[PDB]
Design a binder for this molecule. Structure first.
Ligand SMILES: [Mg+2]
Ligand SMILES: [Zn+2]
Ligand SMILES: [Zn+2]
Lengths: 483, 1337
């Protein structure tokens, strides 16, 4: 009756053993094959080829860079610090196969063997270019949707015709796939003298209109139809290959994964979280690996996973997030502390390590202030179960009814005092400071409501002090002087 | 704020849509420097609310220039900061999951519904196997599991035509599929087909589930969840300390792990992995979820670095540190304080010492208002520093205020109501509260380190409540029983006993006075003895006229003390009352009768003065204990020498080997006990009257003047066994084993123990001490259970117009009266008109109060049975009348309606128990004799002998009221008959206590028929005598050839015809089980009354009693009248062929005939006649009998239990909790509602009071009444909130939630927890205002 999915997953990974050393190279073979065969799917295209120099001169004409993108782009594997001269070379030849390919695709049509192999050469000169990051994927999202549009029109007309007709489908497909341009099938369907087809014949003007927007997308997209209809499936298959083949490798080295994981299963976080992040670091080691380097695969992901773990625990694993830099320097600290202990035989001081760590006591004492964790309200610091620590804290925000009485008696005396003032000025003194309002009026607006004069108001401040301060009403203020 | 009622419900998803402000994002909190919240995480101000005044996180938008602006840098908003606590965010879910309470608890609620078991569903939802959503091809089935591999077989077989899946989604789909209607009608139908018991039960269960979901409208698909709420921070805070070092909840990591695992999940769903890891992640997900809901339920519990498990949500609601018991019912409070406590001897009843600074602190705003009123402290800060000056006016004012401002008084344990009181203040120059001493009683308190605490009657309502209710004048009799609780304790009673006393010795004997005043002149001039009988006049009074005093004077030869002590008498009373040395019981009856006769205050004032004079004279009386008071008698040594010689003789015998060891044990232990008794006689006769003092005569002695003895005789302290402890040998000692030791103690405390003797004392000492520590939890546990049942009840009504209840008769049996039927009636109200043995003299018109005029008026009469409008026979919907209860004790009058009856019942009942865990028959005296429901026979000796076991003999007095009642065996041998007159001291009855006789009331020849040697029997022929019979073996030992043949020696006439049971046609021969061995031979005669055969051979108890615990060994009863025979022959147990007179025979049940039988295979009983032996089941009694039988049974039982410890409580306390154990009756027929189900006997009595009424003659349904164990009865209740508060809350939550429950706030618990007033007593009036307001709309 085991409740622990630790057992579940160690058992079910127990299904799969380790497969190595040609499966390493044979998943690789199937996948590089799928890659080069999606690129053969790219070797085929029609006018759809109006693609490469377009979105490539998109990046050339505006001073193509050598920052992140070309660290993504071609960078061929040698079975570099990119030259700005070889780039300028590479921005001239590709324009030629394109243009010599256009009219030769317009020469008699598309079925032409020499032209076909010149387009295979166009691929070949494309096929020196690796299958490289996002703008490619975006250029492929293009196709991912254009296919779906093609199938959208299919779905639309399959609905409209096949769901309605519902007996007559055979002859429809026959004469339609036959003719496909003119309305020579309709009367060919109707030579059998069908009165309900006579009833429909009033709408034929709109039926071939419903075929008009069918055929409109043909211009709006520009397909060689069979050609694209092959290219789509070919690349679909070059995808499916790897999508299958890698899962083998993934299931293989699960035991390396779990093994390395269970070093840093000191009581830092938890089993399966380390395990999950190890799967992550793996799968990213999988996306990239070369057999060609001729090394054991283990080393590779042993780097990758290690990274993933090493900073995932640092990201997570605390109620306090600490950015990595502190984490690193804490590692410096903790390691060097111990060397200095051996050297010393005792605990080294903040200054001694301010010297040796190479940074000043500021940052020492600083970090020393920082590195501790929260201690969980529900602890019974009452040794007997009488007091969990949550009780003894204070609520230091809210309110004092005593001070409420204080301020209320104050404001009462305030307005009681303001009652004994000049009426010309009473108004002013109200609005000048925002008494009895949500407002803050101090200046020119007052100048227009009452009188543009502004600094005789100041003289009247002096007045009011004299009217009030000289012991007339001071005594009731002075009880609030202690406030 | 105000609201009527509450309503549970499921949280719909659209309800969280309806509650929500924002879905949440990354979980971080702050900048390690800028200790300020981050966003869309945990402490995000933006959605719960703002922290400071009108500021975004960066500070772009402020000042109300940017009034409504949300800050486009940080998306942070502008508002006040209170809504944090009323809002709740939410979180959308990437998947669906199900809620656990609808799964894991008993009946599942979900697979329960579905008729799919649980582990099936587990195995689906641990994601290890698929299962048919829908048998597309019905080839396969909905609710059909398909393994990961068998699934494949079906899969490549068919493909399209099934839905068979795994995970919450599939379950959504299915529950979303299933209809309620058709299942429901079809269940109701095919119940009719075979409503077999378990089957029908299950049918009902699912039917209810169906129609519940129908009518509540709650949905099953909402069982599954895809959005989850979120809690605001300050219930889960994160707060600092001096070191910049913080503190956090147990919870925040739960959300942290949950959100992070969601992040991982969605992250990996972007990426199209194998579903293996998808499974692993989501199992971690559900793990985190249901561990949040309950950490330590399902898997190995979850801890932090603590290694303590992490507190669930559920835990916070739960246990004692749950909300209910921790901070909602018991609570810290402002305006209170506490103190060490000392006496105030000189005080008066109303007074309490009060360290003034306590009140000073407590009465602050009073005097501040008073100084703004005077204006010396015009402002308040001035008030503070003036307070701080200590102005005398401070104190003048404080005395001014404290006048008439009453106060509360608290010791713990406040076990019963009187463990707190309310007195008037009086101030003192010290940090030591004084009090009136006598009320240590109610507190059980003592001046040894005890403590007390105080609370304040701020509101005038509380002020007046206090002064009218908990003013000590109010409450001086217990409400449980009618005694004063202000008994003068130890010293006062003793000085009293000293004064009111009659030496012969001292002086001043045989003179005359006019009155006690000149005796005071003497005694205070110091001239006369005070405990000295001397002639003098008095002038007493009496209200013999219609409450009008009757004056007259005359003489008495009385002690001087008693004469003086008259002086305090308040003018109603005889001098005969004051004519003795006044035992502590005497003082009790003094104060009793004063209050009984006059009213309160004379008795009050009397009492105070008595305490005062006790102080005076016992300070005068002279008192010390010492070493020469301690005297051992002389004739003790040689008794021990006799014991030594005798045990040496018994030693020589055991050495010789004749006598055994356990025999010897009983011998030795009994003779040592006799030695202790002899020593007791010695010391008591050598101490109590050791004093010889001569007055005008040679020699004479009287009561001793030794300190120790008078301490014993006053009842102040001491006891004869205790004096034996100091002086004599004290008995013997039980070791912790429970054995009892063979060598008791020799010396005493006066001489000095032995090493071993004290080492031996240790055992039982520590035993009793651990018991002292560890019997109390039982009491408190018990107590809160009891009250948990019974709060709901309060008096509804004045007269319920109801009809008779139970009969009242005394409990005198075994010895003399043990409750006078007088005392039983006291304050009760009749069931009916009631007359006198002088017949047809009615005094109640079906109901009156029965006060001591009536009680004694009818104690004259020899009536000995009355009925009463019972506690339970009352019939008010939702409570009772007042009549059916009768009289308030502690008041001493009929209650006016509106007060809690349960609470005082339990305080009456459980309060005391804390201390309280720690042959022949012979007439004594002459009188009439009554034996009824009797069939017997004049035996061959000429006397009566029983044939009806029901009979028991009585000693009836010459009048007719019973003196004694005693059981008598079937066929036991008497020396007397019924309704005769016989001398005291006579052994009428005799029987071998091992025989169970087989008397023959027929007379006739006997022949060895039906029975053959070794076959049904053995033939044992007595080696002793020579005369025997066919000798019947037991169940086992006879050879099985005739163990299927009931052996029967047979009675016949001369002709061989069976002598019929004379007068009836039933033949008369005996089917013999084992041990009924006959002495006569073949052809021999028995006579009427002639044996053919003879057949040879605590507190938690009460916990079982009221819990309705039902024993293991029933002494079972006759289900129905008529003849009976035995059943199938022991496949495990034998059975019982019932045969009614005219009804149906077939009913039989298993019998262990390893436990003796009472009836035999050709013997008749009446229904409700006992058949087996041992204890029995009360459930059967109610099942068979009515109410009064079982009622009477247990009340007698447990009253005898506690009366062992000599503890006196009236019955109604008991009668009332019973009716709360009957809140339900199970239905018989149907047509009103469903067939049987246990439904409110109240609501039952309503619907029959409507439906069987002219609505119909009957559509509805008869019923039977149902018992419930108290702890289950409580739970099995309408209200849930009370039911949520004490036990098993979670399941109660679920069960309410499922159905759309809605409480109505009537109960005490209900209306307290809301902060409303009581619907009773004080707020009775306001609540009934609200009642007829709702009546009035
Ligand atoms: Mg004490
Ligand atoms: Zn901002
Ligand atoms: Zn009643």
């Amino acid at each position: 009756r085991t409740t622990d999915p630790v057992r579940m997953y160690m058992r079910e990974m127990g299904t799969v053993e380790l497969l190595t050393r040609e499966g390493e190279i044979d998943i690789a073979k199937r996948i590089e094959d799928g890659i080069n065969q999606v690129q053969c799917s790219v070797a085929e295209y029609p006018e759809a080829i109006t693609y490469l120099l377009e979105q490539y001169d998109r990046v050339e004409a505006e001073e193509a860079r050598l920052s992140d993108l070309i660290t993504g782009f071609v960078d061929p594997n040698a079975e570099n610090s990119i030259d700005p001269e070889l780039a300028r070379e590479k921005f001239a030849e590709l324009r030629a196969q394109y243009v010599v390919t256009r009219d030769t695709i317009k020469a008699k049509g598309r079925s032409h063997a020499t032209a076909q192999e010149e387009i295979l050469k166009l691929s070949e000169v494309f096929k020196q270019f690796r299958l490289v990051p996002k703008q490619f994927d975006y250029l492929v999202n293009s196709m991912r949707v254009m296919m779906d549009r093609v199938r959208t029109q299919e779905r639309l007309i399959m609905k409209l015709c096949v769901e309605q007709c519902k007996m007559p489908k055979k002859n429809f497909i026959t004469l339609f796939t036959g003719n496909e341009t003119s309305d020579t099938w309709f009367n060919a369907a109707i030579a059998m003298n069908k009165p309900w087809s006579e009833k429909l014949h009033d709408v034929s003007e709109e039926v071939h209109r419903a075929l008009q927007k069918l055929q409109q997308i043909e211009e709006e997209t520009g397909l060689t139809i069979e050609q694209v209809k092959d290219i789509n499936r070919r690349m679909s298959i070059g995808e499916a290959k790897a999508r299958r083949a890698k899962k083998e490798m993934v299931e293989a080295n699960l035991r390396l994964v779990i093994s390395i994981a269970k070093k840093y299963t000191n009581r830092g976080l938890q089993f399966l979280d380390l395990i999950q992040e190890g799967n992550i670091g793996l799968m990213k080691a999988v996306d990239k690996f070369e057999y060609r380097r001729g090394y054991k695969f283990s080393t590779y992901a042993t780097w990758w996973i290690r990274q993933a773990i090493t900073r995932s625990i640092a990201d997570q694993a605390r109620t306090i997030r600490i950015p990595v830099h502190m984490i690193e320097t804490i590692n410096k600290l903790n390691r060097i502390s111990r060397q200095m202990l051996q050297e010393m035989g005792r605990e080294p001081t903040p200054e001694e390590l301010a010297e040796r760590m190479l940074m000043p006591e500021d940052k020492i004492r600083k970090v020393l202030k920082i590195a501790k964790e929260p201690i969980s309200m529900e602890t019974p610091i009452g040794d007997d179960e009488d007091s969990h620590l949550g009780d003894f804290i204070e609520d230091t925000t809210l309110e004092l009814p005593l001070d409420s009485a204080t301020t209320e008696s104050l404001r009462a005396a305030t307005h009681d005092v303001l009652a004994g003032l000049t009426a010309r000025e009473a108004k002013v003194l109200r609005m000048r400071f925002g008494i009895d309002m949500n407002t803050d009026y101090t200046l020119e607006e007052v100048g227009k409501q009452f009188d543009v004069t502004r600094e005789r108001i100041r003289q009247i401040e002096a007045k009011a002090l004299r009217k009030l301060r000289h012991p007339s009403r001071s005594e009731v203020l002075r009880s609030f002087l202690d406030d | 704020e105000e609201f009527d009622a509450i309503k549970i419900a499921l949280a719909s998803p659209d309800m969280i849509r309806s509650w929500s402000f924002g879905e949440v994002k990354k979980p971080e909190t702050i900048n390690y420097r800028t200790f300020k919240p981050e966003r869309d995480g945990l402490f995000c101000a933006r959605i719960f609310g703002p922290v400071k005044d009108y500021e975004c996180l960066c500070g772009k938008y402020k000042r109300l220039k940017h009034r409504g602006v949300i800050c486009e840098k940080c998306g942070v908003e502008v508002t006040q900061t209170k809504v944090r606590r009323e809002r709740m965010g939410h979180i959308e879910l990437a998947s669906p999951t199900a809620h656990i309470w609808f799964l894991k608890s008993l009946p599942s609620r979900i697979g329960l519904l579905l008729d799919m078991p649980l582990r099936d569903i587990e195995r689906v939802l641990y994601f290890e196997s698929y299962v048919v959503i829908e048998g597309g091809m019905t080839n396969l089935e909905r609710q059909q599991i398909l393994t990961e591999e068998q699934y494949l077989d079906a899969l490549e077989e068919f493909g399209d035509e099934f839905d068979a899946k795994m995970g919450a989604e599939a379950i959504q789909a299915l529950l979303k599929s299933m209809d309620l209607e058709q299942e429901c009608e079809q269940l109701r139908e095919e119940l009719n087909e075979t409503n077999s018991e378990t089957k029908r039960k299950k049918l009902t269960k699912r039917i209810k589930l169906l129609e519940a979901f129908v009518q509540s409208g709650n949905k099953p698909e909402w069982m599954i969840l895809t959005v989850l709420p979120v809690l605001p921070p300050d219930l889960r805070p994160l707060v600092p300390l001096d070191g910049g070092r913080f503190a956090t909840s147990d919870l925040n990591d739960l959300y942290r792990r949950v959100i992070n695992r969601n992040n991982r999940l969605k992250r990996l769903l972007d990426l199209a992995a194998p579903d293996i890891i998808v499974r692993n992640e989501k199992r971690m997900l559900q793990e985190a979820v249901d561990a949040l809901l309950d950490n330590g339920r399902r898997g190995r519990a979850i801890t932090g670095s603590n290694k303590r498990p992490l507190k669930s949500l559920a835990d916070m609601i739960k246990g004692k540190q749950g909300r209910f018991r921790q901070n909602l019912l018991g609570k810290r409070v402002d305006y209170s304080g506490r103190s060490v406590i000392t006496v105030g001897p000189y005080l008066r009843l109303h007074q309490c010492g009060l360290p003034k600074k306590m009140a000073l602190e407590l009465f602050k705003p009073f005097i501040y208002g008073k100084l703004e009123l005077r204006g010396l402290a015009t402002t308040i800060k001035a008030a503070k520093k003036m307070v701080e000056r200590e102005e005398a006016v401070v104190w003048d004012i404080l005395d001014e205020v404290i006048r008439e401002h009453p106060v509360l008084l608290n010791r713990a344990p406040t076990l019963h109501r009187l463990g707190i009181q309310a007195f008037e203040p009086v101030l003192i120059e010290g940090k030591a509260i004084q009090l009136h001493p006598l009320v240590c009683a109610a507190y059980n308190a003592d001046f040894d380190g005890d403590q007390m605490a105080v609370h304040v009657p701020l509101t005038l309502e509380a002020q007046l409540e206090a002064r009218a209710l908990m003013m000590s004048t109010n409450n001086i009799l217990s409400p449980a029983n009618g005694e004063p609780i202000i008994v003068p304790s130890q010293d006062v009673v003793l000085g009293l006993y000293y004064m009111t006393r009659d030496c012969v010795n001292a002086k001043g004997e045989g003179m005359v006075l006019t009155g006690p005043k000149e005796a005071e002149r003497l005694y205070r001039s110091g001239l006369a003895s005070l405990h000295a009988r001397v002639k003098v006049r008095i002038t007493e009074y009496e209200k013999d006229a219609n409450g009008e005093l009757v004056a007259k004077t005359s003489l008495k030869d009385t002690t001087v003390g008693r004469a003086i002590l008259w002086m305090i008498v308040p003018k109603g009373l005889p001098y005969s009352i004051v004519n003795q040395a006044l035992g502590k019981k005497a003082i009790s009856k003094m104060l009793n009768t004063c209050y009984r006769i006059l009213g309160l205050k004379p008795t009050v004032i009397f009492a105070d003065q008595i305490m005062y004079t006790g102080f005076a004279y016992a300070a005068r009386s002279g008192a010390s204990v010492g070493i020469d008071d301690m005297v051992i008698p002389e004739k003790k040594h040689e008794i021990i020498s006799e014991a030594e010689a005798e045990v040496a003789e018994i030693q020589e015998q055991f050495q010789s080997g004749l006598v055994t060891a356990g025999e010897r044990y009983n011998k030795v232990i009994d003779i040592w006990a006799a030695a202790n008794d002899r020593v007791s006689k010695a010391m008591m006769d050598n101490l109590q009257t050791e004093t010889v003092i001569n007055r005008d005569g040679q020699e004479e002695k009287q009561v001793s003047f030794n300190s120790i003895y008078m301490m014993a005789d006053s009842g102040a302290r001491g006891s004869a066994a205790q004096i034996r402890q100091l002086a004599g040998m004290r008995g013997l000692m039980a070791k912790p084993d429970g054995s009892i030791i063979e060598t008791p103690i020799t010396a005493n405390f006066r001489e000095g123990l032995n090493v071993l003797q004290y080492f031996i004392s240790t055992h039982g000492a520590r035993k009793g001490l651990a018991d002292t520590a560890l019997k109390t939890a039982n009491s408190g546990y018990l107590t809160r259970r009891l009250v948990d049942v019974a709060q709901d009840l309060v008096v509804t009504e004045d007269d319920c117009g109801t009809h008779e209840g139970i009969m009242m008769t005394p409990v005198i049996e075994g010895g003399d009266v043990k409750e006078p039927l007088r005392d039983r009636v006291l304050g009760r109200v009749t069931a009916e008109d009631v007359l006198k043995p002088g017949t047809a003299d009615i005094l109640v018109p079906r109901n009156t109060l029965l006060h001591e005029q009536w009680c004694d008026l009818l104690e004259e009469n020899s009536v000995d049975a009355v009925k009463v409008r019972s506690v339970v026979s009352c019939d008010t919907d939702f409570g009772v009348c007042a009549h059916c209860y009768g009289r308030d004790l502690a008041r001493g009058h009929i209650i006016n309606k509106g007060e809690a009856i349960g609470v005082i019942a339990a305080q009456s009942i459980g309060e005391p128990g804390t201390q309280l865990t720690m042959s022949s028959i012979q007439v004594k005296n002459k009188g009439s004799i009554k034996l009824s429901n009797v069939k017997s026979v004049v035996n061959s000796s000429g006397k009566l002998v029983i044939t009806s076991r029901n009979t028991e003999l009585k000693l009836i007095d010459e009048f007719g009221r019973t003196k004694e009642s005693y059981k008598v065996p079937y066929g036991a041998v008497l020396a007397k008959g019924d309704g005769e007159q016989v001398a005291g001291g006579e052994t009428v009855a005799n029987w071998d206590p091992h025989t169970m006789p087989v008397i023959t009331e027929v007379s006739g020849f006997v022949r060895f028929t039906d029975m053959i040697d070794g076959q049904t029997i053995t033939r044992q022929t007595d080696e002793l005598t020579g005369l025997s019979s066919l000798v019947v073996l037991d169940s086992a030992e006879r050879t099985a050839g005739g163990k299927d043949l009931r052996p029967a020696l047979k009675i016949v006439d001369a002709q061989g015809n069976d002598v019929l049971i004379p007068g009836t046609d039933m033949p008369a021969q005996y089917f013999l089980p084992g041990k009924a061995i006959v002495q006569l031979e073949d052809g021999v005669q028995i006579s009427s009354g002639d044996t053919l055969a003879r057949i040879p051979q605590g507190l938690p108890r009460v916990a079982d009693l009221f819990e309705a615990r039902r024993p293991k060994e029933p002494a079972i009863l006759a289900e129905i009248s008529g003849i009976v025979s035995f059943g199938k022959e022991t496949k495990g147990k034998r059975r019982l062929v019932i045969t009614p007179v005219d009804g149906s025979d077939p009913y039989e049940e298993m019998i262990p005939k390893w436990r003796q039988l009472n009836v035999f295979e050709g013997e008749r009983v009446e229904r409700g006649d006992v058949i087996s032996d041992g204890p029995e089941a009360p459930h059967d009694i109610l099942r068979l009998r009515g109410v009064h039988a079982v009622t009477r049974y247990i009340v007698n039982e447990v009253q005898d239990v506690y009366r062992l410890q000599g503890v006196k409580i009236n019955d109604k306390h008991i009668e009332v909790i019973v009716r709360q154990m009957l809140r339900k009756a199970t239905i018989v027929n149907a047509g009103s509602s469903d067939f049987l189900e246990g439904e409110q006997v109240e609501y039952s009595r309503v619907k029959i009071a409507n439906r069987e009424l002219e609505a119909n003659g009957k559509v509805g349904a008869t019923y039977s009444r149902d018992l419930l164990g108290i702890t289950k009865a409580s739970l099995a209740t309408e209200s849930f909130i009370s039911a949520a508060s004490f036990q098993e809350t979670t399941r109660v939550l679920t069960e309410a939630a499922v159905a759309g429950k809605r409480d109505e706030l009537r109960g005490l618990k209900e209306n307290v927890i809301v902060g409303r007033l009581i619907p009773a007593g004080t707020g009775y009036a306001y609540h009934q205002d609200r009642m007829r307001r709702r009546a009035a709309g």
